[PDB]
Amino acid sequence: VQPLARDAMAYVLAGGRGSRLKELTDRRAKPAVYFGGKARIIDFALSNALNSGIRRIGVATQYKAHSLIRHLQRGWDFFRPERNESFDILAASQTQWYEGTADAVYQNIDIIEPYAPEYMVILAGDHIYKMDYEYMLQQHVDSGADVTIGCLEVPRMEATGFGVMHVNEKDEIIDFIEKPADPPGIPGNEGFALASMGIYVFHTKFLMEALRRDAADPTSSRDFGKDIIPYIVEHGKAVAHRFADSCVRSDFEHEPYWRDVGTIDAYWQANIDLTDVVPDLDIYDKSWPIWTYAEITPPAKFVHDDEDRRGSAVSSVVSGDCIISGAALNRSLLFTGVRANSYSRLENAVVLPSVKIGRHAQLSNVVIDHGVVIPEGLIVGEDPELDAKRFRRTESGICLITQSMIDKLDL
Amino acid sequence: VQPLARDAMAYVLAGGRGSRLKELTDRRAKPAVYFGGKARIIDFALSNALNSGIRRIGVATQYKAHSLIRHLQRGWDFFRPERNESFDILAATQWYEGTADAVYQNIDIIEPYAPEYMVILAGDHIYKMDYEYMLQQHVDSGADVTIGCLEVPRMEATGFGVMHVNEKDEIIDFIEKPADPPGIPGNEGFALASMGIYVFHTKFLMEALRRDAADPTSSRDFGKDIIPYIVEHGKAVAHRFADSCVRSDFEHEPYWRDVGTIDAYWQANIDLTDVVPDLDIYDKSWPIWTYAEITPPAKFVHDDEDRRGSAVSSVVSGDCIISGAALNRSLLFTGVRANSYSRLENAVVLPSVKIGRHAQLSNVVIDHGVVIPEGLIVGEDPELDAKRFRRTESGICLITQSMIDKLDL
Amino acid sequence: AAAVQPLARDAMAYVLAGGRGSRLKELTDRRAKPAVYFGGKARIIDFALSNALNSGIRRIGVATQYKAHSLIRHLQRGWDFFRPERNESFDILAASQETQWYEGTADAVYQNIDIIEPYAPEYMVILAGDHIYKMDYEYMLQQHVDSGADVTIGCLEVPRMEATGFGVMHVNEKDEIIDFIEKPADPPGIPGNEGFALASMGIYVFHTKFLMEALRRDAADPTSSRDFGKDIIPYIVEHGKAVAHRFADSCVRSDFEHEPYWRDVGTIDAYWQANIDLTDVVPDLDIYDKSWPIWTYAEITPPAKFVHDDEDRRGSAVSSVVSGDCIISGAALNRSLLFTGVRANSYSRLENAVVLPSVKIGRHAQLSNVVIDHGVVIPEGLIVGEDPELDAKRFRRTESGICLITQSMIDKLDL
Amino acid sequence: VQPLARDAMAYVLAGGRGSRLKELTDRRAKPAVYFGGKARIIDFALSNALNSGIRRIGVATQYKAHSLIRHLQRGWDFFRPERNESFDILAATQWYEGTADAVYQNIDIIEPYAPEYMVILAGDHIYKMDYEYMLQQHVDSGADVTIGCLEVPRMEATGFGVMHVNEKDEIIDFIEKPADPPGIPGNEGFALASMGIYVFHTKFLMEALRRDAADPTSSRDFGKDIIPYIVEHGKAVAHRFADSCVRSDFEHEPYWRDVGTIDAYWQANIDLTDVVPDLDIYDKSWPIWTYAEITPPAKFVHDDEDRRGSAVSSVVSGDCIISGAALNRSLLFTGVRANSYSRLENAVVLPSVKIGRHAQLSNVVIDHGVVIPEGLIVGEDPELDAKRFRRTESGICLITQSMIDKLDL
């Protein structure tokens, strides 16, 4: 009768570095990366935990986690222990670092056991999705599984880049293959394979034993995906949970939404798609809200309207404390505090907070880093060979622009 | 050596009805009226107190305070008594008989705090002011009351309560709306208009307060009764707004607005859409706190040969979706939905308003939550607009849902 | 859902906190009964509110009326952590929805339909805010939707003799209420075992749609006293489907609670009794149960302090419960419950004393079997509990021999 | 008119080892050490900054700071940047090389705030002080630094960093722990001992840090390198603690404790059990903020000839259950449980400690979380108590769970 989330603790793995995001994660961890206009990536997993009724959350951080920890301190500060709530920030140590994803839990057993939760919900903190974990908790205790694993249903070509669960008639996992050339199809549903989301449900006592076992192991790489889960799919019982079964779909979302934003192109695409008339992600959904750190800001402002300059945004998303002064914006996403100045133009641009666009500058197909000041008259998106020399340019043509790249510029 | 603000308590009078705002205040008090895009009028006096260092604030409410009180509970909820902070919401034993009575019935709330000074404030004006200047002038002068006063040219002061002042800024008389306002000595052509801001010693204020409660013939007002008495038999001095006004570098003069009429209200909000506004709402040095929620960003959608969602010379808040609507010189509060083929011009649009397709509205103030009917035209036909809505002599229409429900289209 | 999502996600608890608490006398002269202190730190209303919170209900509305300044200020300060953008809400609904009052209990929801409906909750959990108890409302929500009832009613299973002071539900064997009698002299008994009747706790669960219509019908009736208990519920036991939910099925009992705990604290004797019992070795109510915690308004205070110890005076508490910011200086406490900020001075003695916050006990004072009102300053040497006739004429004394002491009483004293 | 605190930023040095506190600081920094019953040591410097009107606070942490950082996250969480206030936890070439480097490495977070004044604080002492006095003295004297100094008898100053002064409190020389300290002119027999409290102009300090970091010969330390440097070239002036100490009307002298030893730590806490304590913790005029949870009250149960649960000449916090336990001259923090027939005397008992039945503990400091085994005896046998636990030369025993875990005889 009692919802299982009451006795569950969410453990969010947020030590990911996000290498292929390049300079975008040079001084911040991937979960701390901005998304959607006002939030960070980590906020989705945490909001999923909150909205699912999970009252205890732990966040494990590792490398370049200053801005992530500061975000968590100021954004996720409303939990009170005397109301049986808890939000623990568990930075590395805890010697220096976590030797792995599983080690990130093992090192903090004495944080977990005082709470004595019945269930452990292990979550990847670097994905953008909405999901009700209550469904996954029910399945785990119903099935009697040692571990329940959240899985995406993806076409078999696409599953080649994922960790794939080999499933039987009863969605029981018989084998795990990382990056299969030919991914095992679902029994009776070939053409689709199950891709692991990096979401794991355990009974706490089982998980504590499995990580103590893993720690005393000289060969282990101390990871769930590589050491913990492969051991269980063999000796124990591992079952699969479908994302479609628990995904919280807005009535304005055509399919279960899940983004890894693992590359610059992917990050740019996921953000720009929010400027659609009908976007895949419905950020205006009130049923399953995403909490984050936000300050009271002034409203967006658009000025100038003459023969040579007009401050205006079309097909765009614009946040607070933005002043669009004689600047033309099209198909762009502007985070809080952007200053765009006269005669400048933005097209296909994802613009992170507190960026300044100088007069006469024209930028197309770009991701601009937090706080960057774009010099007056700079042009991006016109000369591919020039843009590649100056900035990080994808083969799709998206340029990532940071202040360090701008500093090296006089030509 | 220690700031006097440590020993001050701000008492904000927020029972003001704002009758001339008409339907705008039929279901709310004037301090609860939205302004600027995100705040309410009451937030300016309260933020002035906060930024001046005053840790104790009382707010007297009266007329339709349900929305005002709720705003205060949720927006101004960060004061903690054990840190010597307090925020008391004092709702009206029944009716307060006046602004003095509002302070009289709550003496047992003030005395436990035992503040040295009381800063009495009008909660229905828009301005920024450092009250530390008033407090020190009040203490250094030895005055029974120090009164905040605007320096306005002798002609605009005919609509104010004017303080007649001598060479030492001592108030020698007070005249309500004089036909020929008394001038400043050595600076005729300028008169001192009362701001509704009064600074007392708490001991003195409590006596004058109780004395007024002892007068059966008193109208129980600071303006009608308390202040004129002190002007006569005591010592009243004036404090210049220009001295303590907190001006931004991007503000060309001391900013103070009464927004007493629908025209004045409309004007003050639309002027924020200027390239260089009189009020700098982007000044981080003297911030205005209010009740704000986490909202989605503003969204502009549609860009074809027939419809384009875009704002021009405008101010747009969060949770706003401008879908195929053309906005010009407009101020949009939070949560507005403007739909395809609609157009807004010179429009003050309060929160949660929905604009139906093909609607064209010009020179309007749209009340909170109003759903504009598809195809509705305002600003095109003065006789017809005045028939349907509340239309000022200068052509600004106030639009409420009750007026819309009278329609048939 | 899928028999998956908990029903509390789509529920709104509506707490009726307008109760005068008349029999409590001077204790409720300038405060409503739900604002009456209890336990040493909290107020009565904090239990129904914490029950709602711990049960997973995130939308809360509180209807006030009778001198609710202190009550509203308590909710303002203590229950301020709900955020609307997280789909949580806390609404303080003071009487004005017009002019006068709410005409009763049902009107309290009728006047605020405009606040309820924008939330559009699927279920309404109507709560009485003047009781002390711990309960998981999810159970009652599950039963309500599984039974198909028009209203589910929380009921205590009490001895039939004791039920004569309760609104009594008559049921069949499947706990379907067939009649409701207010204070029956000879209450009807449960099928299967007579001697116990089902006592309505004043806790009702509705489908919001059914409730909204059932209340505008009540407002459309001039014969109606506009009450849930007297008008709404008795009308439903006839025309529709009323089912009983038993407290023992959903009560949250600690490992150190031998029975389901529920107190009305309607009289001075029972209010004194309920508080003093907390000084027991094994209290009926476990206030140290972290599994179902009671949130309240609390400030950071200094610890409790006890001083001197000699010939004649020793500041010490025995068989007592002492809150923060208390200074027990040369004061002997015994079987007493002290709220925050109490100052008991030398040569004073307290026994069987419920001492509300900020009370000062002057030197040499000796008080026994008393309830001391908030902030009351007890004069030095004042003896209470020695002479019944003198105590009776001087204070509010019960037939059991308990004196309620207010500052009003103290100041108009002779010798 | 404007108080100087509005433009000041407190910078708290909280990397203090507290190494002589031994096992008390094995897994926590000294500022994170509990004091007074509900607070930690660093809460005093932070409350001082708060009550002085300083809205920007930076805390520099170094070693074993997980417990410290967590305390600051949860306790000092009410600062909102948009209200022009901030609370920065500055953790972090590699670590901080010194107290002066702790500021140089965080210039990137200081410069955006652009404060006009910096108030460098030691976060490992226990004192109440109004920093506004010190701020004012700084700008009036035109000093390059102003330093908080205790006026102590010369023999007591032998363990301090000591300042010379001339006849106008201008600092002439600084000596690190002098056996024969220089005396103040006019009132000899007393010297000026450093509080580790510095006040700079922010732009003077930033160039001081950049200069220091550019000196290879530097130990990167404030009092070792920065301060005595400007003592010679620049202008260093001493500020008397007694001038700005916030003394309660129940404090017979300025209160300041370093609690560096187990002896000094035990003494300071147990002094709070006095009938007339040197430190007035009940002073609501200058309150100390900290992390605190809603707890149940303190409970005293059982009343026999064999056992009686009660506290005498003691201080007891919330969530404490004194069951058949006899307490005398003891200070209990939150959550302490003491079981039947046990006896505490002269005991400082940290949070969530459990005293098992029949235990007898005298002259002790029990670490946080420690479970004392049933029947344990401390206070009867010096040579045994020294063998089992950490025993001071005065006879105080520090008891950790370690010593209890290895406890056999």
Coordinates of N, CA and C in Angstrom, one line a residue, chain A residues 190-240:
Chain A
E190 N 12.6 -8.0 -32.8 CA 13.9 -7.7 -33.5 C 13.8 -6.4 -34.2
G191 N 14.9 -5.7 -34.4 CA 14.9 -4.4 -35.0 C 15.0 -3.3 -33.9
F192 N 14.7 -3.7 -32.7 CA 14.9 -2.9 -31.5 C 15.8 -3.6 -30.5
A193 N 16.7 -2.9 -29.9 CA 17.5 -3.5 -28.9 C 17.4 -2.7 -27.6
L194 N 17.7 -3.3 -26.4 CA 17.7 -2.6 -25.2 C 19.0 -2.0 -24.8
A195 N 19.0 -0.7 -24.7 CA 20.2 0.1 -24.3 C 20.2 0.5 -22.9
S196 N 21.2 0.2 -22.1 CA 21.3 0.6 -20.7 C 21.3 2.1 -20.5
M197 N 20.5 2.6 -19.5 CA 20.5 4.0 -19.2 C 21.5 4.4 -18.1
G198 N 22.1 3.4 -17.5 CA 22.9 3.7 -16.4 C 22.1 3.9 -15.1
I199 N 20.9 3.3 -15.1 CA 20.0 3.4 -13.9 C 19.9 2.0 -13.3
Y200 N 20.2 1.9 -12.1 CA 20.2 0.6 -11.4 C 19.4 0.6 -10.1
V201 N 18.5 -0.3 -9.9 CA 17.8 -0.4 -8.6 C 18.3 -1.6 -7.8
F202 N 18.6 -1.4 -6.5 CA 19.0 -2.5 -5.6 C 18.2 -2.5 -4.3
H203 N 18.2 -3.6 -3.7 CA 18.0 -3.6 -2.2 C 19.3 -3.1 -1.6
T204 N 19.2 -2.2 -0.7 CA 20.4 -1.6 -0.1 C 21.4 -2.6 0.4
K205 N 20.9 -3.6 1.2 CA 21.8 -4.6 1.8 C 22.5 -5.5 0.7
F206 N 21.8 -5.8 -0.4 CA 22.4 -6.5 -1.5 C 23.6 -5.7 -2.1
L207 N 23.3 -4.4 -2.3 CA 24.3 -3.5 -2.9 C 25.5 -3.2 -2.0
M208 N 25.3 -3.1 -0.7 CA 26.4 -2.9 0.2 C 27.3 -4.1 0.2
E209 N 26.8 -5.3 0.1 CA 27.6 -6.5 0.0 C 28.3 -6.6 -1.3
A210 N 27.6 -6.2 -2.4 CA 28.2 -6.3 -3.7 C 29.4 -5.4 -3.9
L211 N 29.4 -4.3 -3.2 CA 30.4 -3.3 -3.3 C 31.6 -3.5 -2.4
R212 N 31.3 -4.2 -1.3 CA 32.3 -4.6 -0.4 C 33.1 -5.8 -1.1
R213 N 32.3 -6.6 -1.7 CA 32.9 -7.7 -2.5 C 33.7 -7.2 -3.6
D214 N 33.3 -6.1 -4.3 CA 34.0 -5.5 -5.4 C 35.3 -4.8 -4.9
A215 N 35.2 -4.3 -3.7 CA 36.4 -3.5 -3.1 C 37.5 -4.5 -2.8
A216 N 37.2 -5.6 -2.3 CA 38.2 -6.6 -1.9 C 38.8 -7.3 -3.1
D217 N 38.4 -6.9 -4.3 CA 38.7 -7.5 -5.5 C 39.9 -6.8 -6.2
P218 N 41.0 -7.4 -6.3 CA 42.2 -6.8 -6.9 C 42.1 -6.5 -8.4
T219 N 41.2 -7.3 -9.1 CA 41.1 -7.1 -10.5 C 40.1 -6.0 -10.9
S220 N 39.1 -5.8 -10.1 CA 38.1 -4.9 -10.4 C 38.5 -3.5 -10.8
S221 N 37.8 -2.9 -11.8 CA 37.9 -1.5 -12.2 C 37.0 -0.6 -11.4
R222 N 36.3 -1.2 -10.4 CA 35.4 -0.5 -9.5 C 34.3 0.2 -10.1
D223 N 33.6 -0.4 -11.1 CA 32.5 0.2 -11.8 C 31.3 -0.6 -11.8
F224 N 30.1 0.0 -11.8 CA 28.8 -0.7 -12.0 C 28.7 -1.4 -13.3
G225 N 28.9 -0.7 -14.4 CA 28.7 -1.2 -15.7 C 29.7 -2.2 -16.1
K226 N 31.0 -2.1 -15.6 CA 32.0 -3.0 -16.0 C 32.3 -4.1 -15.0
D227 N 32.0 -3.9 -13.8 CA 32.4 -4.9 -12.8 C 31.2 -5.4 -12.0
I228 N 30.3 -4.5 -11.5 CA 29.2 -4.9 -10.7 C 28.1 -5.6 -11.5
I229 N 27.6 -4.9 -12.5 CA 26.5 -5.5 -13.3 C 26.9 -6.7 -14.1
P230 N 28.1 -6.8 -14.7 CA 28.4 -8.0 -15.3 C 28.5 -9.2 -14.4
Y231 N 28.8 -9.0 -13.2 CA 28.9 -10.1 -12.2 C 27.5 -10.7 -11.9
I232 N 26.6 -9.7 -11.8 CA 25.2 -10.1 -11.4 C 24.4 -10.7 -12.5
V233 N 24.6 -10.3 -13.7 CA 23.9 -10.8 -14.9 C 24.3 -12.3 -15.1
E234 N 25.4 -12.7 -14.5 CA 26.0 -14.0 -14.6 C 25.5 -14.9 -13.4
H235 N 25.9 -14.5 -12.2 CA 25.7 -15.3 -11.0 C 24.4 -15.0 -10.3
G236 N 23.8 -13.8 -10.5 CA 22.6 -13.4 -9.9 C 21.5 -13.3 -10.9
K237 N 20.4 -12.5 -10.5 CA 19.3 -12.2 -11.4 C 19.2 -10.8 -11.8
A238 N 19.4 -10.5 -13.1 CA 19.2 -9.1 -13.5 C 18.0 -9.0 -14.5
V239 N 17.2 -8.0 -14.2 CA 16.0 -7.8 -15.1 C 16.0 -6.5 -15.7
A240 N 15.3 -6.3 -16.8 CA 15.2 -5.1 -17.6 C 13.9 -4.3 -17.3

